[PDB]
Design a protein around this ligand. Structure first.
Ligand code: HEM
Ligand code: HEM
Ligand SMILES: Clc1cccc(CCCNCCc2ccnc(-n3ccnc3)n2)c1
Ligand SMILES: Clc1cccc(CCCNCCc2ccnc(-n3ccnc3)n2)c1
Ligand SMILES: C[C@H](O)[C@H](O)[C@H]1CNc2nc(N)[nH]c(=O)c2N1
Ligand SMILES: C[C@H](O)[C@H](O)[C@H]1CNc2nc(N)[nH]c(=O)c2N1
Ligand SMILES: [Zn+2]
Lengths: 405, 404
């Protein structure tokens, strides 16, 4: 009946319509002629003002004062600030709402049931790389909380016309080094070969382990990036063991507690925060399947399968599926043992389904990227697999940005 | 302009130029992507242009573009449409069209095989009885005592003003689903409705979990007729496990032949509303979707308890462990019974080879990532890390409404 995408759950037979997508102001990559929904990265005061107006309207709606005196005054205040300076600034409570809405709007994040509980740290007074380091350490301490992890984001000053950006060069606050070898192989995390070489070029004395924590490369405006080593006591790690396979511990595997993305751009009302690291807690498949089993990452599948004595000479033995399972179980078991927050892919997807129902009621839909929401193992075993999803771009948003080098 | 397609495991990049040949809109728009949706939301000049396009494809396929045989066939088609509002395919054109529709099917992981397809012309069918004979031959040919062979049987095309030839069943072989008094379902819950239709049309129902359904076949503007498949035609594989001796005691089994019977085959503007096709199973279809889906046979918990796994919590990964052993049982049992089957690793590996072949042959390949990526162990397969472009090429298989 209604002129909006009809969305179906095939497990439960239930139907919803997404009216929220009508609020989207920015185009995705798809056209009627072809769907590009599987691509990871698909390709002026007038413009700013309309984005600023839209966001201020969003903010005043959220506090139930849409159409009010203070609403129209804030609108006038922003237009006049853009009139004289070419940009404008957010009130603290506007920044908090916007950071939360950006998370809420993130189609690829399965953790969004938690969106209303996000600690927003204002670091818009930051004026140096040393000061960025302090704020980042504070974020890591607060968010790690000795294993009882808390969602947090730290927001550094916005892009300024003329002036250069605040940037964190690392893709995460915690990452393991990747050292290219003579034979052409990589020791450590192959994902991190480039940032590792950048750190060395900038004066880091490199290790030679599989799990060396990288230093931070931090760039304050119009300045070369400075190098900062995180003090080991701040970086909580978890040695990996298996509940029943006693040899698993002898593999010497481990992972860090805090998943903190540090290279994404936070956009709010046309303002761009080029440095705004955020952190949650892991879903176990991120570590157990992607980081540890991706062929282009640590690639430990064959190693674990040989220890399990599987027939790795034939696909039909399902040796890959078997090893992958035990590795995920190991990640789950070790984090629980160490009392570090983690969520398995079953409980995560169940909570996301609950989130979808909340947002259906609250907003008339929820933008979601099926390929990213569905876990990388046991897909159809989780409820989200059977849930159709509409994907679109809402603002405030987190967006990829080019590497600063 | 043209999509840039990256494989994130290998760092390799292709560009899809084939998508520019799409003449049919999918569900997406720049404002929102609807790629995860299973189904679509919903004259002479048009038909003639779809026809010329297809005849052009055919003659190009046999390296005779521009030949007088090409020119003459274009005029036959034009003369026939201009006089009758429609036209008919030559058998060779039909054979080519069916192979191309399979080739162009974005959701099929089995397309490496697309050039090897037995095509039965059943367009001289005038009754449900005759459809049944054709279907039985298809099943015999395709099953081949467990050495499965891909096949399609093509029944008469749609015609203006008259009803369609239709097979009412969604597959040639399906197990019955009997709604019990207490709201549960004995058998396959996916087939409750088709089971009820069969009973209403005179079928005497069984009461098992794996009762093979009769076929409801419909000749134009006639009530469907009921036909029981001779039990010797329907090859089945009892499921057992290589190391778990108790597994056979579950009484599980599945049929050898995966044959879709409710899709529409469109070629050159002509529509074939009954054109059942079959290949062979990819193991996860049976082991994961058919047996483990919560709204199907849903055996996960049962298997987990036999394995004495901790069912109380999600974090023991009991579901993941049980699912793996079930898929293993399927592979072992089909291999023991000498029935053709492909595991999801072998399948996805051959699909990558197909993507490469198609890049060289056509400059691209329409693929639906959500469907190509297996339902367990996704990122453990190469297709997970492969960007894909989805679009509709013709000849095509399409969904169509239920005839009831
Ligand atoms: C609280 C627990 C959280 C969980 C369990 C969680 C889970 C996830 C997962 C599994 C992904 C997929 C990432 C990948 O596969 O590369 C993801 C992506 C993402 N998350 Fe979260 N997340 C959480 C918190 C947060 C927070 C606090 C934010 C921001 C305020 C956030 C924003 C995002 C964004 C923007 C992406 C997309 C990143 C990309 O496209 O590369 N998440 N999340
Ligand atoms: C020969 C071995 C074959 C294999 C291994 C194979 C594999 C698959 C699989 C796994 C699917 C997804 C089905 C689902 O999960 O619902 C699929 C879909 C499909 N296949 Fe095949 N297939 C084979 C042969 C064929 C043949 C012979 C045809 C037609 C001539 C064909 C046409 C299609 C079409 C049109 C779909 C989409 C079905 C839908 O949208 O419901 N396949 N295939
Ligand atoms: Cl090489 C490349 C190019 C484009 C996108 C890509 C995705 C990787 C980044 N995606 C986020 C991964 C990640 C890591 C730690 N933590 C989170 N995280 C934290 C809270 N929520 C998600 N997410 C890679
Ligand atoms: Cl319930 C619902 C409504 C609309 C579409 C849907 C798709 C399911 C069927 N998709 C094909 C399943 C299937 C079964 C047997 N065999 C094959 N098969 C054979 C060769 N290739 C695929 N495919 C379900
Ligand atoms: C090619 C494909 O889009 C790519 O491998 C995607 C698929 N889904 C994903 N899903 C999540 N959560 N994270 C990822 O990195 C990816 N990668
Ligand atoms: C909603 C979602 O698109 C739907 O459940 C899809 C996902 N991928 C699939 N993939 C295959 N092979 N078969 C399916 O039925 C589905 N179902
Ligand atoms: Zn799309």
């Amino acid at each position: 009946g209604p002129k909006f995408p009809r969305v179906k759950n095939w497990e439960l037979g239930s139907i919803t319509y997404d009216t929220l997508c009508a609020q989207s102001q920015q185009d995705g990559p798809c056209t009627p002629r072809r769907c590009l929904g599987s691509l990871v990265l698909p390709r002026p005061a007038e413009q700013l003002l309309s984005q600023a107006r839209d966001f201020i309207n969003q903010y005043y709606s959220s506090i139930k004062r849409s159409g009010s005196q203070a609403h129209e005054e804030r609108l006038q205040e922003v237009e006049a600030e853009v009139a004289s300076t070419g940009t404008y600034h957010l009130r603290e409570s506007e920044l908090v709402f916007g950071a939360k809405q950006a998370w809420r709007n993130a189609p690829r994040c399965v953790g969004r049931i938690q969106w209303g509980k996000l600690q927003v740290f204002d670091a818009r007074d930051c004026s140096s790389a040393q000061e960025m380091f302090t704020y980042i350490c504070n974020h890591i301490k607060y968010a790690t909380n000795r294993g009882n992890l808390r969602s947090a984001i730290t927001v550094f000053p916005q892009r300024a016309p003329g002036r250069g950006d605040f940037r964190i060069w690392n893709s995460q606050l915690v990452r393991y080094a990747g050292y290219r070898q003579q034979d052409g192989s990589v020791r450590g995390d192959p994902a991190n070969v480039e940032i590792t070489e950048l750190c060395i070029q900038h004066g880091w004395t490199p290790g030679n382990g599989r799990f060396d924590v990288l230093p931070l490369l931090l760039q304050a405006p119009d300045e070369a990036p400075e190098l900062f080593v995180l003090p080991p006591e701040l970086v909580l790690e978890v040695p990996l063991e298996h509940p029943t396979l006693e040899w698993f511990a002898a593999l010497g595997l481990r992972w860090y507690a805090l998943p903190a993305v540090s290279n994404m751009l936070l956009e709010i009302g046309g303002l761009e925060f080029s440095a705004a690291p955020f952190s949650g807690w892991y879903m176990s498949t991120e570590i157990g399947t992607r980081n540890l089993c991706d062929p282009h990452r640590y690639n430990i599948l064959e190693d674990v399968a040989v220890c399990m004595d599987l027939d790795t000479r034939t696909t039909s033995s399902l040796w890959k599926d078997k090893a992958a399972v035990e590795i995920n179980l190991a990640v789950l078991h070790s984090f629980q043992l160490a009392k570090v927050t983690i969520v398995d892919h079953h409980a995560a997807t169940v909570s996301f389904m609950k989130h979808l129902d909340n947002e259906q009621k609250a907003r008339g839909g929820c933008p979601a990227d099926w390929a990213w929401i569905v876990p990388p193992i046991s897909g159809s075993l989780t409820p989200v697999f059977h849930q159709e999803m509409v994907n679109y771009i809402l603002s405030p948003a987190f967006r990829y940005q080019p590497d600063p080098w």
